Amino acid sequence: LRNVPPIVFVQDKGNAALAELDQLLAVADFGPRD
RNA sequence: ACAUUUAACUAAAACCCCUACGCAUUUAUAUAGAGGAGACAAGUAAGUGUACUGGAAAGUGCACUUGGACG
Ligand SMILES: [Mg+2]
């Protein structure tokens, strides 16, 4: 790019949610045959 | 181009040429029209030179400059 504005690095907190939900769903108990 | 005759017992008389200039030269005066400047009035950073496209508005190509940015 000819002109790039100043770069700001911002943490993303929308990924930890899905990671932790998958972690919980991988060991959670579900209904009989459901 | 044109031109020294008369006179002279004191001494004087006579003396008279032809051509420049225009359909040239020099500027200026006015007018057919055309075009200017001034006044009034109302993301691609920025430039220089050059070139092409476009009716314009502008865009793009090549080189150059910082009179920009880069914590
Ligand atoms: Mg130079």
PDB file of C-alpha atoms (C1' of nucleotides) and ligand atoms in Angstrom:
ATOM      1  CA  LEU A   1       0.000   0.000   0.000  1.00  0.00           C
ATOM      2  CA  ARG A   2       1.174   3.538  -0.679  1.00  0.00           C
ATOM      3  CA  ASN A   3      -0.170   4.816   2.663  1.00  0.00           C
ATOM      4  CA  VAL A   4      -0.799   2.617   5.711  1.00  0.00           C
ATOM      5  CA  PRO A   5      -2.339   4.213   8.834  1.00  0.00           C
ATOM      6  CA  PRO A   6      -0.759   3.438  12.217  1.00  0.00           C
ATOM      7  CA  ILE A   7      -1.154  -0.229  13.133  1.00  0.00           C
ATOM      8  CA  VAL A   8      -2.928  -1.135  16.382  1.00  0.00           C
ATOM      9  CA  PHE A   9      -2.836  -4.723  17.642  1.00  0.00           C
ATOM     10  CA  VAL A  10      -6.067  -5.691  19.418  1.00  0.00           C
ATOM     11  CA  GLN A  11      -6.664  -8.943  21.266  1.00  0.00           C
ATOM     12  CA  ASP A  12      -9.536 -11.099  20.030  1.00  0.00           C
ATOM     13  CA  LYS A  13     -11.777 -12.554  22.743  1.00  0.00           C
ATOM     14  CA  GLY A  14     -14.283 -14.240  20.411  1.00  0.00           C
ATOM     15  CA  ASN A  15     -12.057 -17.292  19.865  1.00  0.00           C
ATOM     16  CA  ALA A  16     -11.520 -18.287  23.494  1.00  0.00           C
ATOM     17  CA  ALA A  17     -15.298 -18.677  23.758  1.00  0.00           C
ATOM     18  CA  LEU A  18     -15.515 -21.363  21.082  1.00  0.00           C
ATOM     19  CA  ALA A  19     -12.323 -23.059  22.284  1.00  0.00           C
ATOM     20  CA  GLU A  20     -13.641 -23.363  25.842  1.00  0.00           C
ATOM     21  CA  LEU A  21     -17.104 -24.422  24.678  1.00  0.00           C
ATOM     22  CA  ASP A  22     -15.604 -27.214  22.582  1.00  0.00           C
ATOM     23  CA  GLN A  23     -13.464 -28.202  25.570  1.00  0.00           C
ATOM     24  CA  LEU A  24     -16.596 -28.473  27.718  1.00  0.00           C
ATOM     25  CA  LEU A  25     -18.756 -30.221  25.102  1.00  0.00           C
ATOM     26  CA  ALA A  26     -16.062 -32.846  24.486  1.00  0.00           C
ATOM     27  CA  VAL A  27     -16.497 -34.254  28.020  1.00  0.00           C
ATOM     28  CA  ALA A  28     -20.070 -33.288  28.885  1.00  0.00           C
ATOM     29  CA  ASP A  29     -22.767 -35.917  29.382  1.00  0.00           C
ATOM     30  CA  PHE A  30     -25.739 -36.124  27.009  1.00  0.00           C
ATOM     31  CA  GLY A  31     -29.039 -37.949  27.090  1.00  0.00           C
ATOM     32  CA  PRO A  32     -29.563 -41.676  26.536  1.00  0.00           C
ATOM     33  CA  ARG A  33     -28.939 -42.362  22.829  1.00  0.00           C
ATOM     34  CA  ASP A  34     -29.526 -38.619  22.256  1.00  0.00           C
TER      35      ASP A  34
ATOM     36  C1'   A B   1      26.057  69.262 -71.031  1.00  0.00           C
ATOM     37  C1'   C B   2      28.088  74.178 -72.291  1.00  0.00           C
ATOM     38  C1'   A B   3      31.823  77.981 -73.431  1.00  0.00           C
ATOM     39  C1'   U B   4      36.067  84.818 -74.991  1.00  0.00           C
ATOM     40  C1'   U B   5      34.308  87.747 -78.554  1.00  0.00           C
ATOM     41  C1'   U B   6      34.729  93.036 -79.306  1.00  0.00           C
ATOM     42  C1'   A B   7      38.051  96.721 -78.148  1.00  0.00           C
ATOM     43  C1'   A B   8      42.728  99.243 -76.760  1.00  0.00           C
ATOM     44  C1'   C B   9      44.885 108.840 -79.046  1.00  0.00           C
ATOM     45  C1'   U B  10      41.864 108.259 -71.579  1.00  0.00           C
ATOM     46  C1'   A B  11      39.608 102.939 -71.241  1.00  0.00           C
ATOM     47  C1'   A B  12      35.860  99.769 -71.430  1.00  0.00           C
ATOM     48  C1'   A B  13      31.777  96.575 -73.566  1.00  0.00           C
ATOM     49  C1'   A B  14      29.632  91.445 -73.500  1.00  0.00           C
ATOM     50  C1'   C B  15      29.008  87.090 -70.257  1.00  0.00           C
ATOM     51  C1'   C B  16      22.491  84.120 -68.046  1.00  0.00           C
ATOM     52  C1'   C B  17      22.921  75.591 -70.062  1.00  0.00           C
ATOM     53  C1'   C B  18      19.521  70.435 -69.125  1.00  0.00           C
ATOM     54  C1'   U B  19      17.309  66.940 -66.404  1.00  0.00           C
ATOM     55  C1'   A B  20      14.001  64.439 -59.941  1.00  0.00           C
ATOM     56  C1'   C B  21       9.267  61.722 -58.502  1.00  0.00           C
ATOM     57  C1'   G B  22       7.057  56.625 -58.911  1.00  0.00           C
ATOM     58  C1'   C B  23       2.768  51.049 -60.601  1.00  0.00           C
ATOM     59  C1'   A B  24       9.159  53.827 -55.723  1.00  0.00           C
ATOM     60  C1'   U B  25      10.005  54.355 -50.119  1.00  0.00           C
ATOM     61  C1'   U B  26       8.207  55.142 -45.135  1.00  0.00           C
ATOM     62  C1'   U B  27       5.333  54.728 -41.564  1.00  0.00           C
ATOM     63  C1'   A B  28       0.786  55.859 -39.818  1.00  0.00           C
ATOM     64  C1'   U B  29      -5.448  56.616 -40.129  1.00  0.00           C
ATOM     65  C1'   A B  30     -10.165  53.983 -40.444  1.00  0.00           C
ATOM     66  C1'   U B  31     -12.831  50.052 -41.200  1.00  0.00           C
ATOM     67  C1'   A B  32     -14.514  42.691 -42.135  1.00  0.00           C
ATOM     68  C1'   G B  33     -13.638  39.693 -38.361  1.00  0.00           C
ATOM     69  C1'   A B  34     -10.945  36.836 -34.528  1.00  0.00           C
ATOM     70  C1'   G B  35      -8.842  36.500 -29.597  1.00  0.00           C
ATOM     71  C1'   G B  36      -7.130  37.941 -24.925  1.00  0.00           C
ATOM     72  C1'   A B  37      -6.509  40.187 -19.767  1.00  0.00           C
ATOM     73  C1'   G B  38      -9.014  43.210 -16.116  1.00  0.00           C
ATOM     74  C1'   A B  39     -13.232  44.980 -13.283  1.00  0.00           C
ATOM     75  C1'   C B  40     -18.278  43.690 -11.358  1.00  0.00           C
ATOM     76  C1'   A B  41     -20.547  39.465  -9.928  1.00  0.00           C
ATOM     77  C1'   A B  42     -20.968  35.384  -7.301  1.00  0.00           C
ATOM     78  C1'   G B  43      -7.684   4.987  -0.791  1.00  0.00           C
ATOM     79  C1'   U B  44      -4.348   6.538  -4.507  1.00  0.00           C
ATOM     80  C1'   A B  45       0.866  12.664   0.032  1.00  0.00           C
ATOM     81  C1'   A B  46       2.386  17.260  -2.521  1.00  0.00           C
ATOM     82  C1'   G B  47       4.971  19.151  -6.829  1.00  0.00           C
ATOM     83  C1'   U B  48       8.653  20.044 -11.589  1.00  0.00           C
ATOM     84  C1'   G B  49       9.448  18.837 -16.838  1.00  0.00           C
ATOM     85  C1'   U B  50       7.585  16.280 -20.985  1.00  0.00           C
ATOM     86  C1'   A B  51       4.170  13.109 -23.670  1.00  0.00           C
ATOM     87  C1'   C B  52      -0.738  10.766 -24.873  1.00  0.00           C
ATOM     88  C1'   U B  53      -6.296  10.461 -24.125  1.00  0.00           C
ATOM     89  C1'   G B  54     -10.434  13.570 -23.284  1.00  0.00           C
ATOM     90  C1'   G B  55     -14.997  18.847 -25.302  1.00  0.00           C
ATOM     91  C1'   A B  56     -13.743  19.859 -20.545  1.00  0.00           C
ATOM     92  C1'   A B  57     -13.310  18.206 -15.481  1.00  0.00           C
ATOM     93  C1'   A B  58      -8.988  15.525 -15.202  1.00  0.00           C
ATOM     94  C1'   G B  59      -6.353  10.663 -15.718  1.00  0.00           C
ATOM     95  C1'   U B  60      -2.108   7.737 -16.975  1.00  0.00           C
ATOM     96  C1'   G B  61       3.225   6.834 -18.505  1.00  0.00           C
ATOM     97  C1'   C B  62       8.925   8.174 -17.675  1.00  0.00           C
ATOM     98  C1'   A B  63      12.604  10.746 -14.884  1.00  0.00           C
ATOM     99  C1'   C B  64      13.465  14.111 -10.885  1.00  0.00           C
ATOM    100  C1'   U B  65      12.455  16.983  -5.753  1.00  0.00           C
ATOM    101  C1'   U B  66      10.751  16.837  -0.062  1.00  0.00           C
ATOM    102  C1'   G B  67       8.924  22.117   0.215  1.00  0.00           C
ATOM    103  C1'   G B  68       5.264  14.667   3.041  1.00  0.00           C
ATOM    104  C1'   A B  69       4.428   9.991   6.246  1.00  0.00           C
ATOM    105  C1'   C B  70       7.197   5.702   8.102  1.00  0.00           C
ATOM    106  C1'   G B  71       6.002   5.031  16.658  1.00  0.00           C
TER     107        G B  71
HETATM  108 MG    MG C   1      19.071  15.989 -10.032  1.00  0.00          MG
END
